[PDB]
Amino acid sequence: MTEHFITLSTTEPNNNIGIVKLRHADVNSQAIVAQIVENGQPKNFEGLQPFFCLMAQEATGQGVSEESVVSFDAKNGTLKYVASDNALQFVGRNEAYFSFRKQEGGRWIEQFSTRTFHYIVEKSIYSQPFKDSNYWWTFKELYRIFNKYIEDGKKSWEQFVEANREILESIDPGGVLLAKVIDIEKIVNEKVPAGFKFVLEHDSEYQPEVKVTSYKNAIGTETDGFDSGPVFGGGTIYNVPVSLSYDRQKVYVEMPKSYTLAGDIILIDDGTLLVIKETQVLCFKMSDAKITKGYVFV
Amino acid sequence: ASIKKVYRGMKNGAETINDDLEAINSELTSGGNVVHKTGDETIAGKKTFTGNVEVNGSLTLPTKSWSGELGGGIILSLRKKGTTVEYSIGGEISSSILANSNLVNRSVPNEFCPRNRCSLVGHMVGGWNAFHIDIPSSGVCQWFGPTASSGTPRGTGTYPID
Amino acid sequence: ASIKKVYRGMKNGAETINDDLEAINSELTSGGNVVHKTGDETIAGKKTFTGNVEVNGSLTLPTKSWSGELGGGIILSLRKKGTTVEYSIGGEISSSILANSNLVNRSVPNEFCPRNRCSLVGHMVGGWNAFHIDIPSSGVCQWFGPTASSGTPRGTGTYPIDS
Amino acid sequence: ASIKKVYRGMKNGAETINDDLEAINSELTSGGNVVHKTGDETIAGKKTFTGNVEVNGSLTLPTKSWSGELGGGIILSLRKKGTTVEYSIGGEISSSILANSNLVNRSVPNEFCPRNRCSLVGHMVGGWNAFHIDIPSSGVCQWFGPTASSGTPRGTGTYPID
Amino acid sequence: ASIKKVYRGMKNGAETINDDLEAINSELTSGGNVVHKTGDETIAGKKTFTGNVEVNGSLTLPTKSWSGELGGGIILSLRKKGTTVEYSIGGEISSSILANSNLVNRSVPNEFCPRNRCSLVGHMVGGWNAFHIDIPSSGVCQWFGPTASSGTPRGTGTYPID
């Protein structure tokens, strides 16, 4: 993270000497490293809690801006204050200082403070207001509304399905059946190896292990040429559930109905075969044997 | 001493004052960062005593010992104590040592080497024979006596280092 | 310092505190159990000075003196100063002392006896004659020079007592 | 420590006591008239240590140096360190010095002169020759060796003053 | 190794066992009270090796040295290495030593004295002359050669003590 080094005094009449410049959009990066000095020697603020006191223009009161400094060494008079979202809030030429107090029961005993230093906050693209849809906006405002749409949208949809489902299954003695069967059937079409059938011919006299994977927009299979697809090098890869059946030099791979794809059969030099239909690719990896032929079953 | 602050409208005021006075008075008898008239304590820093100092017990100073055969069979035993090194000549002359010659068998360490050239007066067992060995700033001792082949070297004393 | 206890509802609250503060402050300047920068005080206990010590006055250490004729008119004056004993050879040789023989007239006390054998280099008045007397841990001094019957022995220096 | 008087019906009683306690506590750590375990401080008065004193650093004592030709070409270098004076014999014998005669060229100053007669044993470069010089309370040194006209005198050690 | 007790119905049992096993395993590689195959360690107690011991580095044993003129000008240099003492004959015969006579100048210390009488064979420089010195349990050496008054004695070897 970014650090700003300052050697602040309590005796030397500086008033304005020492600038700290940072931006509005700087979450947890901007840090103030200060050395506290009194009469040329470091002052020990042991038993006193440090505070970042900010005198913001356009936002004054009794507690203009004050926050406890967490990282500090009172033995040597050093502190590290990380700029909080409240300190970044006030864009413009501001004044700040560090205070050290000994508070007990509401009322304070002792409180000594350092000289004032300039705390200048520069605008960000997030702070600057912009014109969108005929109205003037700030980022935080628009980001809040969009995240409300995304979260209330999800909640409204999960309630839509829940309420709709309960019309069919909860209000009917035989309607529960229709709902349940339709869901089971779909799972069996995607997770159970029953629908799709494929034959792999090999050179081995034994039972070679076959692993099947399905993926879209693979290398050099995208519609508009190389690197034209949304996910470069292949999208999501699905490990296809398989039911293996063996005969002499023939492996029968049963797969779910959803993985049914009739395309071009490409045989690679080793124990690897692909079925490519435009963007959709079905991969067959065979161990301890060499694929000679591959074809679907009717 | 670790003391608590006293202020107006303080809860347990009389208790705080008493605890602060007791903490202070405790350091007046034992412990803390103060030298006492009684007890074993460690003192740090450059202390200047303008008055007269009297020691009834034992005075301990940094001690370092060294012994080695300088040359020809002459063994010198050295013991450093502050700014004064105590020498002890011993052994037996085996080989012939020339007059005003250098002893090259063993050299005196730099921590025992004096600023000025010191002479160590010794006596030979047997007759009325006397000898002296010079220690330079380098540490390479010299036999300032006449040419001798046999004899017993003896002599104990002190020599300055600064 | 002798201080009074402070408690709630104390008759004379401020008075007691004042006397306690004055009693402590009195010990900060003079007396008590603390070592001061001014005045003559007695200190007890093992004091280890890690820093540098500077003395402008005079340093005093335990002192004990002894004098006696070792053998054949040879009187040795000894004075102990902590860990170093100062020797002084005097008198005049009356009787004949043999070469490499022990002086049996009077022995050196144990409090002056060193751990290791120490040689005391001396000079005879008149000639270029030199001699050395060895002091063992026993006490009986041994004349390591040649056979002599007459002469004036002289020699002053220091010898260690510990090793 | 500079402390204020505490009395009944005192204006700002809490601040008076607190400042008195803080002033006393400050002297318990640094400064004041009390000797501390840390920091460079100056101590005055006759301090008697009944216990055992241990020094790890350096011990400094009043030092005074003197050098001069006693007589016949013999130069003696003297250095005082408390109650012990360190001697160093050097130079070359130019003129004839008689046996049991007084050295009249330069006398030893009274501040270096011991109460009793001290014999400083030395050795002549080249042979088995030894010599001793007696120093009385007056300062006039005496060559107790034989009648010598040439030779190199050497000898380093320590002699008591009291 | 410092291990914690394992009991039934123990809160955070998984951590306790792992920490106990790791503490034991740490002592199997370095430190503890056990001797390891690697690292510099100190071993105490009577260790009996029934097998064959092989040393590739250096073997260090308790060493004690002694040197002194036995009689007539014969200096013997002795160095003990546990149960074997290394002797070295040197010097020059100054006074007449009788045949089968005792050397009375310096006696061999009891720590160097053997249980049985040992003969140390030597050779005289410049001639086909040989000599032997007998050392008893007492320490008083005996010259068993002929009545000699002058010559250079030499001889180096080893002799048992037990």
Added chain:
Amino acid sequence: ASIKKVYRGMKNGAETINDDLEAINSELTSGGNVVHKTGDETIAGKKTFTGNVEVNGSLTLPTKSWSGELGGGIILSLRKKGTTVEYSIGGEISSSILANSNLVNRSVPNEFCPRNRCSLVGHMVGGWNAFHIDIPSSGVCQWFGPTASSGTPRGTGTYPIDS
């Protein structure tokens, strides 16, 4: 260490593990089959120390003694200490022993016999006379000195046994 086996579904498992850990930890401090930094222990097997070995106590080695008259009143005392044998020549010559002749009274045992011929330098009591006896691998010692009938043989040292 004698430890119990830990398995799934073990009755009173907490006690079992604790007892096993305590039994192992006991062997880490004292006893067992491991060499400790404290206590008297017996070690077996070929131990090769590649590093430096330092002994502060006493080193003990296998010892075997032998004594006997080699020939003509010449008694040799031998003692083995690992790979070095200590010799001691004693007695007095009674009969006449020829020059370069073998002593046939009693031979040196094979366990004391070296691989190579070793010469034992000795000295005759009375004169500057010297002699040496060669010990071959056979055992029969040979007098390499001149023809002698009387005299006292003496000599003590060490000789190697291996090459």
Added chain:
Amino acid sequence: ASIKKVYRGMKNGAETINDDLEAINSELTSGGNVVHKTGDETIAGKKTFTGNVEVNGSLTLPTKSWSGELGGGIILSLRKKGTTVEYSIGGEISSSILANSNLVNRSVPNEFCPRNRCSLVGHMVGGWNAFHIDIPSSGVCQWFGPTASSGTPRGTGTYPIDS
């Protein structure tokens, strides 16, 4: 020993603990980085034995051998064992060797050279003749006997290398 970590909700907990205890107990009997009471093992590092050490078997030390004709026909056989070098004098004197002269035919290597000057007592075959050869720190041996032209040099013993 290689051990697996034990944690909350671990699959095969009882199995892991047992295999960890068995792995540790295996190193307590044989192998690992620990010295045992039984078996042949290699030890590295500076080991300091404060107690008494007893060896019942054989003690092996680093060995280095050298042999050469020093001068005039005298061959010296050397064998280094730790801090002690075993010497063996042999051969036959061919050329005339002067009294107190240096042997320049072959020099003793620096690894065999002692710190102090050692004398090797020997005996000449034929008579009561004795000789000694000095070995300095340089390596150039010196014949300390009288002027000899013929004879058989013999002598076996030991000499220190360190002082």
